[PDB]
Amino acid sequence: EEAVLTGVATDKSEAKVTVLGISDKPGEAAKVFRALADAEINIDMVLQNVSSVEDGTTDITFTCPRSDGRRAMEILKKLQVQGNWTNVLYDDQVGKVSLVGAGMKSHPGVTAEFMEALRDVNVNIELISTSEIRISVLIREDDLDAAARALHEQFQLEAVVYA
Amino acid sequence: AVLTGVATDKSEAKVTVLGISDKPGEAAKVFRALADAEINIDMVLQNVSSVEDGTTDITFTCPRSDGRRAMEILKKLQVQGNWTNVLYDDQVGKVSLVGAGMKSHPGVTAEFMEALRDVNVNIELISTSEIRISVLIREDDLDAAARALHEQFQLGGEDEAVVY
Ligand SMILES: C[C@@H](O)[C@H](N)C(=O)O
Ligand SMILES: C[C@@H](O)[C@H](N)C(=O)O
């Protein structure tokens, strides 16, 4: 019944790449990911939100090891010019911080307090993604310490019940 | 890479806050409002903000019966945040591929996308990690997507693990 938090994880070893302006039609994500998979880019997370109400296109962001970042840009910039994408952006100064746990679905206060914790130390949340075991956000790598510390304080974190 | 199953869910709605300012504290306003309303949040996805506008969008899923209410409780905050809007969709399906060791095998992500393309299913939202590739699609496309992924990854229906 309860949500249980088992840890706060930080990762400063990734880069994120964003492909902007993809038509929201079948097969467009396949074009991006077949190119990357053929180049052996080790993808950590992919995030694509719903397509825009003003343009109908959407953006796709993914993280990968920083050592894979320049190659992924090379592959994608080639694709960029052949098709109708707006642009491809690179960022190798991103940090990932995650609250790890279980049973968070029925406790929305866990999500609210994760955002409040980072707001209270002025850490801007650049990207959010979640799974069955984690709330993960991408922020400036220089804010990883303030962020992880704020989360440990917010949830009074070895494993803890959300209260 | 070892794949363990294809999971489907047709019990959720998705709600999207459009045009939120990309500055500290704004996601907290969204999520504190949903927590005080006791609305279960299943997945949250926010991509990067636009450099020209300084805004981004946040999408979350929740039980379908709470979707319209979640959208309307968030519309109470739209003006203060100068959001463009809050949308609700109760026709969404979620399909996921579960497995171990996907990070070192990007071919698994590419094949997931190819599978859906080859059955002409448009992917609305993507959220993946090393333990699960999840997408949101129209609920009427759920059966087609799910069968395509069983074929693509040679998975049966008994959760028998299959190496990639
Ligand atoms: C944008 C991309 O996800 C597209 N909707 C597809 O199905 O490939
Ligand atoms: C858009 C929202 O995530 C904002 N960047 C915040 O940190 O609250």
Coordinates of C-alpha atoms and ligand atoms in Angstrom, one line a residue:
Chain A
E1 CA 0.0 0.0 0.0
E2 CA 2.8 2.4 0.9
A3 CA 5.4 3.9 -1.4
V4 CA 9.0 3.0 -0.4
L5 CA 12.0 5.1 -1.4
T6 CA 15.3 3.2 -1.6
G7 CA 17.7 5.8 -2.8
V8 CA 18.8 9.0 -4.7
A9 CA 21.1 8.3 -7.7
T10 CA 23.1 10.9 -9.6
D11 CA 24.7 10.4 -12.9
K12 CA 27.1 13.0 -14.5
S13 CA 28.3 10.6 -17.3
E14 CA 25.6 11.4 -19.9
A15 CA 24.9 13.8 -22.7
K16 CA 21.5 14.6 -24.1
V17 CA 20.7 15.1 -27.7
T18 CA 17.4 16.6 -29.0
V19 CA 16.1 16.2 -32.5
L20 CA 13.6 19.1 -33.0
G21 CA 10.7 19.3 -35.4
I22 CA 9.7 15.7 -36.4
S23 CA 6.5 15.1 -38.2
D24 CA 4.1 13.2 -36.1
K25 CA 3.5 10.3 -38.5
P26 CA 4.5 6.6 -38.4
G27 CA 8.0 5.6 -39.0
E28 CA 9.7 8.9 -38.0
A29 CA 11.0 7.6 -34.6
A30 CA 12.1 4.5 -36.4
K31 CA 14.3 6.6 -38.7
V32 CA 16.1 8.2 -35.7
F33 CA 16.5 5.0 -33.7
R34 CA 17.6 2.7 -36.5
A35 CA 20.4 5.3 -37.3
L36 CA 21.5 5.4 -33.8
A37 CA 21.2 1.7 -33.2
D38 CA 23.3 1.0 -36.4
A39 CA 26.0 3.4 -34.9
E40 CA 26.0 1.5 -31.6
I41 CA 25.0 4.6 -29.6
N42 CA 24.1 3.3 -26.1
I43 CA 20.7 4.9 -25.4
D44 CA 19.9 5.4 -21.6
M45 CA 16.5 7.2 -21.9
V46 CA 14.3 8.5 -24.6
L47 CA 11.6 11.2 -24.0
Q48 CA 9.1 12.4 -26.7
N49 CA 6.1 14.4 -25.6
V50 CA 3.0 14.9 -27.6
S51 CA 3.1 16.8 -30.8
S52 CA 2.6 20.5 -30.8
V53 CA -0.9 22.0 -31.2
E54 CA 0.6 24.9 -33.2
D55 CA 2.9 23.0 -35.5
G56 CA 1.9 19.3 -35.3
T57 CA 5.6 18.3 -35.1
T58 CA 7.3 17.0 -32.0
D59 CA 10.8 16.7 -30.5
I60 CA 12.7 13.6 -29.4
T61 CA 15.4 13.7 -26.7
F62 CA 17.6 10.9 -25.6
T63 CA 20.6 10.5 -23.3
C64 CA 23.7 8.4 -24.0
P65 CA 27.2 8.2 -22.6
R66 CA 29.1 11.4 -23.2
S67 CA 31.7 9.4 -25.3
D68 CA 28.9 8.5 -27.7
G69 CA 27.6 12.1 -28.0
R70 CA 29.7 13.4 -30.9
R71 CA 29.0 10.4 -33.0
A72 CA 25.3 10.5 -32.4
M73 CA 25.4 14.2 -33.5
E74 CA 27.3 13.3 -36.6
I75 CA 24.7 10.7 -37.6
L76 CA 21.8 12.9 -36.8
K77 CA 23.0 16.1 -38.4
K78 CA 23.3 14.0 -41.6
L79 CA 19.7 12.9 -41.3
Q80 CA 18.7 16.5 -40.4
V81 CA 19.7 17.9 -43.7
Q82 CA 18.1 15.1 -45.7
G83 CA 14.7 15.4 -44.2
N84 CA 12.4 18.1 -42.7
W85 CA 13.7 18.3 -39.2
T86 CA 14.2 21.7 -37.6
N87 CA 17.5 21.0 -35.9
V88 CA 19.5 18.7 -33.7
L89 CA 20.9 20.1 -30.4
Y90 CA 23.7 18.7 -28.1
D91 CA 24.3 19.1 -24.5
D92 CA 27.2 17.3 -22.7
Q93 CA 26.9 19.3 -19.4
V94 CA 23.6 17.6 -18.2
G95 CA 23.2 15.8 -14.9
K96 CA 20.6 13.2 -14.1
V97 CA 19.2 12.8 -10.6
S98 CA 16.7 10.1 -9.7
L99 CA 14.6 9.1 -6.7
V100 CA 14.4 5.3 -6.7
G101 CA 11.7 3.3 -5.0
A102 CA 8.5 1.3 -5.4
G103 CA 4.8 1.8 -5.2
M104 CA 4.8 5.6 -6.0
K105 CA 1.8 5.4 -8.3
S106 CA -0.7 5.6 -5.5
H107 CA 1.2 8.4 -3.7
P108 CA 1.2 11.5 -5.9
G109 CA 2.7 13.4 -3.0
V110 CA 6.0 11.7 -3.7
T111 CA 6.1 13.4 -7.1
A112 CA 5.0 16.8 -5.7
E113 CA 7.6 16.7 -2.9
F114 CA 10.4 15.7 -5.4
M115 CA 9.6 18.9 -7.4
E116 CA 9.2 21.0 -4.3
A117 CA 12.6 19.8 -3.0
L118 CA 14.4 21.0 -6.1
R119 CA 12.4 24.2 -6.3
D120 CA 13.6 25.0 -2.8
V121 CA 17.2 24.9 -3.8
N122 CA 16.5 26.7 -7.1
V123 CA 17.3 23.7 -9.3
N124 CA 15.6 24.1 -12.6
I125 CA 14.1 20.8 -13.9
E126 CA 14.9 20.6 -17.5
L127 CA 13.3 17.2 -18.4
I128 CA 11.3 14.7 -16.4
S129 CA 10.8 11.0 -17.0
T130 CA 9.5 8.3 -14.7
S131 CA 9.2 4.5 -14.6
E132 CA 7.9 1.9 -12.2
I133 CA 10.9 2.4 -10.0
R134 CA 12.0 6.0 -10.4
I135 CA 11.4 9.7 -10.8
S136 CA 14.3 11.0 -13.0
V137 CA 15.1 14.6 -13.9
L138 CA 17.7 16.2 -16.1
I139 CA 19.4 19.4 -14.7
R140 CA 22.7 21.2 -15.0
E141 CA 25.4 18.9 -13.8
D142 CA 26.7 21.7 -11.5
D143 CA 23.4 21.4 -9.5
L144 CA 23.7 17.6 -8.9
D145 CA 24.9 18.1 -5.3
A146 CA 22.3 20.5 -4.2
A147 CA 19.7 18.3 -5.8
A148 CA 20.6 15.0 -4.4
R149 CA 21.0 16.6 -0.9
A150 CA 17.6 18.3 -1.2
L151 CA 16.0 14.9 -2.0
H152 CA 17.7 13.0 0.8
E153 CA 16.4 15.8 3.2
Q154 CA 13.0 15.9 1.7
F155 CA 12.3 12.2 2.1
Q156 CA 14.5 11.7 5.2
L157 CA 16.6 9.2 3.4
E158 CA 18.6 3.8 4.0
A159 CA 15.1 2.7 2.8
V160 CA 12.2 4.8 3.9
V161 CA 8.5 4.7 3.8
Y162 CA 6.9 7.8 2.2
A163 CA 5.1 9.6 5.1
Chain B
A1 CA 19.6 -8.1 -23.9
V2 CA 16.9 -10.3 -22.6
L3 CA 13.2 -9.4 -23.1
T4 CA 10.5 -10.5 -20.7
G5 CA 7.2 -9.3 -21.9
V6 CA 4.9 -6.9 -23.6
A7 CA 2.6 -5.0 -21.2
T8 CA -0.6 -3.1 -22.3
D9 CA -2.8 -0.7 -20.4
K10 CA -6.0 0.8 -21.6
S11 CA -7.1 2.2 -18.2
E12 CA -5.4 5.6 -18.3
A13 CA -6.0 9.1 -19.6
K14 CA -3.3 11.5 -20.5
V15 CA -3.3 15.2 -19.5
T16 CA -0.9 17.8 -20.9
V17 CA 0.0 21.2 -19.5
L18 CA 1.0 23.3 -22.5
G19 CA 3.3 26.3 -22.3
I20 CA 4.6 26.1 -18.7
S21 CA 7.5 28.5 -17.9
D22 CA 10.8 26.7 -17.7
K23 CA 11.9 28.1 -14.3
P24 CA 12.2 26.6 -10.8
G25 CA 9.0 25.8 -9.0
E26 CA 6.6 25.5 -11.8
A27 CA 6.4 21.7 -12.0
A28 CA 5.8 21.8 -8.2
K29 CA 2.7 23.9 -8.8
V30 CA 1.3 21.2 -11.1
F31 CA 2.1 18.3 -9.0
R32 CA 1.2 19.7 -5.6
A33 CA -2.2 20.5 -7.1
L34 CA -2.6 16.9 -8.3
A35 CA -1.4 15.4 -5.0
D36 CA -3.8 17.6 -2.9
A37 CA -6.5 16.4 -5.3
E38 CA -5.5 12.8 -4.6
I39 CA -5.0 11.9 -8.3
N40 CA -2.7 9.0 -8.9
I41 CA 0.1 9.8 -11.4
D42 CA 1.3 6.9 -13.4
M43 CA 3.9 8.4 -15.7
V44 CA 5.3 12.0 -16.2
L45 CA 7.1 13.2 -19.3
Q46 CA 8.6 16.7 -19.8
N47 CA 11.0 17.4 -22.7
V48 CA 13.3 20.3 -23.1
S49 CA 11.9 23.9 -23.4
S50 CA 12.1 25.9 -26.5
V51 CA 14.9 28.4 -26.5
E52 CA 12.8 31.0 -28.3
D53 CA 9.9 30.8 -26.0
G54 CA 11.3 29.7 -22.6
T55 CA 8.4 27.3 -22.2
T56 CA 7.8 23.6 -22.3
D57 CA 4.9 21.1 -21.8
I58 CA 4.3 18.4 -19.1
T59 CA 2.3 15.3 -19.8
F60 CA 1.2 12.8 -17.2
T61 CA -1.1 9.7 -17.2
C62 CA -3.6 8.9 -14.5
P63 CA -6.6 6.7 -14.1
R64 CA -9.1 7.4 -16.8
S65 CA -11.9 8.3 -14.4
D66 CA -9.8 11.1 -12.9
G67 CA -8.5 12.5 -16.2
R68 CA -11.1 15.2 -16.8
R69 CA -10.9 16.3 -13.2
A70 CA -7.1 16.5 -13.3
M71 CA -7.2 18.6 -16.3
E72 CA -9.8 21.0 -14.8
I73 CA -8.0 21.3 -11.5
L74 CA -4.9 22.3 -13.5
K75 CA -6.9 24.8 -15.5
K76 CA -7.4 26.7 -12.1
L77 CA -3.6 27.4 -12.3
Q78 CA -3.4 28.3 -16.0
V79 CA -3.6 32.1 -15.8
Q80 CA -1.1 32.5 -13.0
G81 CA 1.5 30.4 -14.9
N82 CA 0.5 32.0 -18.3
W83 CA 0.1 28.5 -19.8
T84 CA -1.3 28.2 -23.2
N85 CA -3.7 25.4 -22.1
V86 CA -4.3 22.0 -20.4
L87 CA -5.6 19.2 -22.6
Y88 CA -7.2 15.8 -21.7
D89 CA -7.3 12.6 -23.8
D90 CA -9.3 9.6 -22.6
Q91 CA -8.6 7.4 -25.6
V92 CA -4.9 6.6 -25.0
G93 CA -3.3 3.2 -24.8
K94 CA 0.1 2.4 -23.2
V95 CA 2.3 -0.4 -24.6
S96 CA 5.6 -1.4 -23.1
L97 CA 8.4 -3.7 -23.8
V98 CA 10.1 -5.0 -20.6
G99 CA 13.6 -6.5 -20.5
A100 CA 17.2 -6.4 -19.1
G101 CA 20.3 -5.0 -20.8
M102 CA 18.6 -2.7 -23.4
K103 CA 21.0 0.2 -22.8
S104 CA 23.9 -1.7 -24.4
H105 CA 21.6 -3.0 -27.2
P106 CA 20.1 0.1 -29.0
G107 CA 18.8 -2.3 -31.7
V108 CA 16.0 -3.1 -29.2
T109 CA 14.7 0.5 -29.2
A110 CA 15.0 0.7 -33.0
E111 CA 13.1 -2.6 -33.5
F112 CA 10.4 -1.4 -31.1
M113 CA 9.8 1.6 -33.3
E114 CA 10.0 -0.3 -36.5
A115 CA 7.5 -2.8 -35.2
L116 CA 4.9 -0.1 -34.7
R117 CA 5.7 1.6 -37.9
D118 CA 5.2 -1.7 -39.8
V119 CA 1.7 -2.0 -38.5
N120 CA 1.0 1.7 -39.2
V121 CA 0.7 2.8 -35.6
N122 CA 1.7 6.4 -34.9
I123 CA 3.6 6.9 -31.6
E124 CA 2.3 9.8 -29.6
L125 CA 4.7 9.9 -26.7
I126 CA 7.8 7.9 -25.8
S127 CA 9.3 7.3 -22.3
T128 CA 12.1 4.7 -22.0
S129 CA 14.7 3.6 -19.6
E130 CA 17.0 0.6 -19.2
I131 CA 14.1 -1.5 -17.8
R132 CA 11.2 -0.6 -20.1
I133 CA 10.4 1.0 -23.4
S134 CA 7.0 2.6 -23.1
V135 CA 4.9 4.5 -25.6
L136 CA 1.5 6.1 -25.6
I137 CA -0.7 5.5 -28.7
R138 CA -4.4 5.6 -29.6
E139 CA -6.2 2.9 -27.6
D140 CA -7.6 1.5 -30.9
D141 CA -4.0 0.8 -32.0
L142 CA -3.1 -1.2 -28.8
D143 CA -3.9 -4.6 -30.1
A144 CA -1.9 -4.0 -33.3
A145 CA 1.0 -2.6 -31.5
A146 CA 1.1 -5.4 -28.9
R147 CA 0.9 -8.1 -31.5
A148 CA 3.6 -6.5 -33.5
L149 CA 5.9 -6.4 -30.6
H150 CA 5.3 -10.1 -29.7
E151 CA 6.4 -10.9 -33.3
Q152 CA 9.3 -8.6 -33.3
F153 CA 10.8 -9.9 -30.1
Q154 CA 9.6 -13.5 -30.5
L155 CA 7.7 -13.3 -27.2
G156 CA 4.9 -15.5 -26.2
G157 CA 2.2 -14.8 -23.6
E158 CA 3.6 -16.6 -20.6
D159 CA 6.3 -14.1 -19.7
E160 CA 9.0 -16.6 -20.8
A161 CA 12.2 -14.6 -21.2
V162 CA 13.7 -14.5 -24.7
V163 CA 17.3 -13.4 -25.4
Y164 CA 17.6 -10.7 -28.0
Ligands
LIG1 C1 7.3 11.4 -33.8 C2 7.3 9.9 -34.0 O1 7.2 9.3 -32.7 C3 6.1 9.4 -34.9 N1 4.7 9.8 -34.3 C4 6.3 7.9 -35.1 O2 5.3 7.2 -34.9 O3 7.3 7.5 -35.5
LIG2 C1 9.0 23.2 -16.5 C2 9.3 22.9 -14.9 O1 9.9 21.5 -14.8 C3 10.3 23.9 -14.3 N1 11.6 23.9 -15.2 C4 10.6 23.6 -12.8 O2 11.8 23.3 -12.5 O3 9.6 23.5 -12.1

